[PDB]
Amino acid sequence: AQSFLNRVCGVSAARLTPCGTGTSTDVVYRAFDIYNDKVAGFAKFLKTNCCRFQEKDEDDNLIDSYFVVKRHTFSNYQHEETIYNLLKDCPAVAKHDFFKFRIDGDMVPHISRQRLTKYTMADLVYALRHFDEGNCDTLKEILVTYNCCDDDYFNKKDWYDFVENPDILRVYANLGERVRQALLKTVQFCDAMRNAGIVGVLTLDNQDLNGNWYDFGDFIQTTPGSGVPVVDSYYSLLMPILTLTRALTAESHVDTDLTKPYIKWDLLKYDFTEERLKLFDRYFKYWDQTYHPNCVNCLDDRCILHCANFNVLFSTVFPPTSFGPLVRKIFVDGVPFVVSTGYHFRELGVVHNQDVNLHSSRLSFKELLVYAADPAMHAASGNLLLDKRTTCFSVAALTNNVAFQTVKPGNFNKDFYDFAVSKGFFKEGSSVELKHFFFAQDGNAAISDYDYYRYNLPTMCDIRQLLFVVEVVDKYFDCYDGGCINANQVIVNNLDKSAGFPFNKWGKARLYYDSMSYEDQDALFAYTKRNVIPTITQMNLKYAISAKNRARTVAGVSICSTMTNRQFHQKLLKSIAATRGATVVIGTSKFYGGWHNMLKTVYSDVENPHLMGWDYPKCDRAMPNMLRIMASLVLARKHTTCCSLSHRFYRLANECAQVLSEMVMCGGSLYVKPGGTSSGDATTAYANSVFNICQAVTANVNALLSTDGNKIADKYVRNLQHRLYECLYRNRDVDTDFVNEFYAYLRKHFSMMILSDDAVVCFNSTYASQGLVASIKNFKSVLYYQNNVFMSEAKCWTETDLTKGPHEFCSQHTMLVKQGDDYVYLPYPDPSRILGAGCFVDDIVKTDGTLMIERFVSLAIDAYPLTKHPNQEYADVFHLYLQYIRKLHDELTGHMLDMYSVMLTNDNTSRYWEPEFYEAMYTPHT
Amino acid sequence: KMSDVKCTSVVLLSVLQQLRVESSSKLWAQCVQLHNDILLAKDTTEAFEKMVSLLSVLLSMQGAVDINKLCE
Amino acid sequence: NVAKSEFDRDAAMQRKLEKMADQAMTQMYKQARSEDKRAKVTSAMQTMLFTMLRKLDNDALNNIINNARDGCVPLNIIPLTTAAKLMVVIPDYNTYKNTCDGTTFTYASALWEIQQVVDADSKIVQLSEISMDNSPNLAWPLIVTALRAN
Amino acid sequence: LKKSLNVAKSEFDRDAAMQRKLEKMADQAMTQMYKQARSEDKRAKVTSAMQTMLFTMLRKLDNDALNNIINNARDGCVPLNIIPLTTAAKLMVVIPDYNTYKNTCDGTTFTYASALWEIQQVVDADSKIVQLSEISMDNSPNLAWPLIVTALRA
RNA sequence: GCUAUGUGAGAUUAAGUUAU
RNA sequence: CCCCAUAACUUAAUCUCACAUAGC
Ligand SMILES: C[C@@]1(F)[C@H](O)[C@@H](COP(=O)(O)OP(=O)(O)OP(=O)(O)O)O[C@H]1n1cnc2c(=O)[nH]c(N)nc21
Ligand SMILES: [Mg+2]
Ligand SMILES: [Mg+2]
Ligand SMILES: [Mg+2]
Ligand SMILES: [Zn+2]
Ligand SMILES: [Zn+2]
């Protein structure tokens, strides 16, 4: 009817075009943040009331202005009228119009909301948090409107990859001011509610993409001045979007206006605590949990995470030159040094060293080692550097020249290649071809590989979700014993590796382990628990075979860091490597039936098993700066007796300073690492494992919450979803009962082999089909908004049949073979990798095969399971290696008869070209 | 044949590195880009072209004598 | 028959103490070597620390630490404010056109009078050879060394 | 009845085992000395060995472009820059005598590396751009014969 | 009991080497 | 200049345990 349209637009002079048909309602499929006694989650539902009416401009062009006329019961209508009349004067409330219109004989009460956008903040956060490259129409439309793109940006191939086309960081950032205005408007709304006495729960789906608020159905009226808005779910689900769109970029300008110039900020100023408090009180005014700008004042690890995400959000406003070690001019023997006297973290705030000696007369070995590892004397006594080759912050150039390091090509073993060719290998059309080589690099290699930390962005996490993910991960990390150990009990393998910078200039780590007595090491470790010691880490180019042209660099962390980290973390990290049958499979050998043991361990009791895996693209350089902190906190939870709160916090601060916010020395100059783990700290593998358990438990959590609870048939998992939403966004303390629960649920329906950065998942098929456990799409969506990377489908694999093992775990393929009278799983590698290792070696001594029958026994040990592969070319490499070993031995004997007269008392060399020696290493008897 | 090209390119780059081509950064970058491209090639016709381009870096400059290396 | 002590204690037990006596001698020699290594590394780190304090330029660093309220300043501003030499690495001629100039440019306030330009080969680069026409004929991780002009 | 061939079973194993350790130590020393001689010989003759290996694989390739470039470089035409592959970019190649000229450049074409290159600037030893004239059978006293031909790819 | 010798099983300890 | 961690092989010693034999 036309009269209904005329009644919808009353006093306001608006030209409306129906968005449906007639006076009937309009069905939309939008995301909702719902919490009832029947359903509770953040999923997409069908809303079937609401007669939408799009407004067209004077020139008959449709704009983003809709008049949603909700139809509901009379009681809700008259209650919402009263609440709106109480909240009429707020500038963040959508213009409501209440009228009754006769539809078919019954005057249905109508609640008309004027000039609100098509989508809400719930839709935006769902699109950016449940991203699917196929079904991304809502995100595409949101980008087309509120002009960010031109509807042609989506014609690009990888327009969302965050690695390919890194310009997706903008196009998103253009929504930052919209989100910031929404935050200001919700703060205004909360102020109005508190000053008017209405108590209610704020939800994202009740705020459009302009900041206006509506739906006052679930609002109760109390005494004026005593309103209690609930902003847990709203802010918590909004947190990950506050950093993708960079909402707090307007706060870097003079009057917080995007047109005005930037604020200058004193170069010397480093505190930034009052500014952080002002930002919190402006944007998160009604977040009832206490926020500490400096994490040193936190209670136990929970304000650490909670206030750390706020700090990482707020630190994007402050200049990047104020984050780093805080130096102070101390006087030793009357000579003024410049040494660190604290640290200013982007997450931990300002941390000050507790033991300071302004006036010193003599420096011991511990003090000399601490001062020599500090970057203060190196950066201060160095020329200023402006390195335009990278976007990372450049501090200083220690030396007056820039060092360019090139990678030498590998050496060619022509004898082995000729032997292989003589044995019918490397033929046109053969399934086994050389694909692993020693790729060489030019001078601009180390710096080019270092300039991949640009993929690491300041990521703000969902604390109301992360604070439960951490509990589930801690449950996964139970049955382990850890704590602090003395220098007597520290086990170090291969003492003389590097000793780190600047300690490379005087010797290896053996020198610093022998020069420092046990009491000296204990004193240094105790000093770490009360002070912050920043260290310099050197980047070194790897020299190893690979199938990709990408260069690889390894971070050589200073010995001053490794010595303390070992004493901190070798009580753990060794029970993890000595525990068999757990989720983490670090330390479990693949020989003597180990592969079969782990595979049957994770097959467990899943009802409808499939297999699933991933590779975490751009790891070690896209890891969020918060998830590494969470990892270090999880590994530090085995310290409730040995360490106090202050000691644990200072150890965490030391680890962040010398691992996370470390000063990377690439070439001959010092840079600043934006974040991410270090490849060579003390816990890279275990930190990666705990980070992998996270974002998988998170994937399960937000795949179980994003399911329509009304469509779930089972009454147990539905109640589990309800209680999970309760424990996430409505409960403050840890519910240990429901942490043991849902962990039993994961172990029953989601079994994992969590090795460092590598995982194999045996999950229930029918639960993933109904969206009750994590899947490939859910894991990809999780990585999109909590890793700043897009995980390609080609990097993932799945298996619908368990008679064939994982498609690829630890670069080893799995096949089911008959060993004796029982079927076992044997890991066989890529034959191209073994052939390339046999052909391309690192040095020229290794080209002489006679000098090394060894390393060929070792390559044949790993290549034995290929002999049972159905492919003949795959099976022939083992025989090739055995024949080459025999040839090497016989030509060594010939050389000994030519050079010498005496042969060799051998007869223990024949086992090395017989299949029995290598077969015995896969039979489970040793 | 790729097995005979992707290996002789490695040998050529090793020889060039041995006779101090890394001193000239431009030449080293060009001859390392060619070597990496040969190692990732998929058609022998376009791999022999890059093999030719990787050669004539040793032959252009009279560092290594050539007449005696071909006595066979 | 009763001469066991003549070869089981006069030739074996009298040799048993020699074994751990000798390993104790080796242990004390290795401990002396470790102490010497400790002394030499101590004297090396002390010399390093006492050597790179003379380069601190203790006339513009004392002027910025004293200006601090608590006495602490970020480390990342010490080179920006006190260093008398600037090294700029230029990957392409466009960067040189934008982020550099002729004999004088300006980075982090200041005024940096260029003293020399050098290439990846680290031999030399003349200031008149850096042009769009001559750019391809140059190795282009160019290092520009400039001095603060005051 | 014992202690005649019986006592010489534990004392006979004494000197025999001692000889066994002596032989074992001698063999270990011999193999260590061998593993050194060979390793140091390898690392001494690296350049010549790598060059010979390279030029053996080059003939085992049995190509045409490589077999033309190397044949020219034996006793004549060698390039001055990296051979370009795109249809653009120039290639300068010395021509050290008349025969190398006539084997390669015949007239506006250049052969070389299994392609045919069109010549652009036949500059002499010093710099005199020689027009295609005295480079004929008539006594060519074209300066020092290195007639660097600059040539573009067709 | 007493040394003497070999034996195998480890375990321990470094060194070399591969794989992840 | 050349990282952390795990597994495996190979060599070489050691502390023995245990077994066996011989002499006393
Ligand atoms: C680089 C890492 F820190 C990553 O945390 C993780 C896997 O990272 P990775 O390299 O497999 O993945 P990558 O980022 O390349 O992924 P793509 O680019 O292919 O997408 O183990 C580490 N790691 C890998 N090799 C080494 C090594 O030798 N030494 C040490 N100490 N650590 C290593
Ligand atoms: Mg609503
Ligand atoms: Mg409602
Ligand atoms: Mg990876
Ligand atoms: Zn706190
Ligand atoms: Zn502790």
Residue numbers in the entry:
A (entry chain A): 4 to 929
B (entry chain C): 2 to 73
C (entry chain B): 43 to 192
D (entry chain D): 38 to 191
Quote the study on this structure:
To investigate the AT-527/AT-9010 mechanism of action we performed cryo-EM studies with the SARS-CoV-2 minimal replication-transcription complex (RTC), comprised of nsp12 and essential cofactors nsp7 and nsp818,19. The overall RTC conformation resembles previous structures, with one nsp12, one nsp7 and two nsp8 proteins. The RdRp domain adopts a canonical right-hand fold, with fingers, palm and thumb subdomains (for review). As for all viral RdRps, the active site is formed by five conserved motifs, A-E, located on the palm subdomain, with two additional motifs, F and G, located in the finger subdomains.
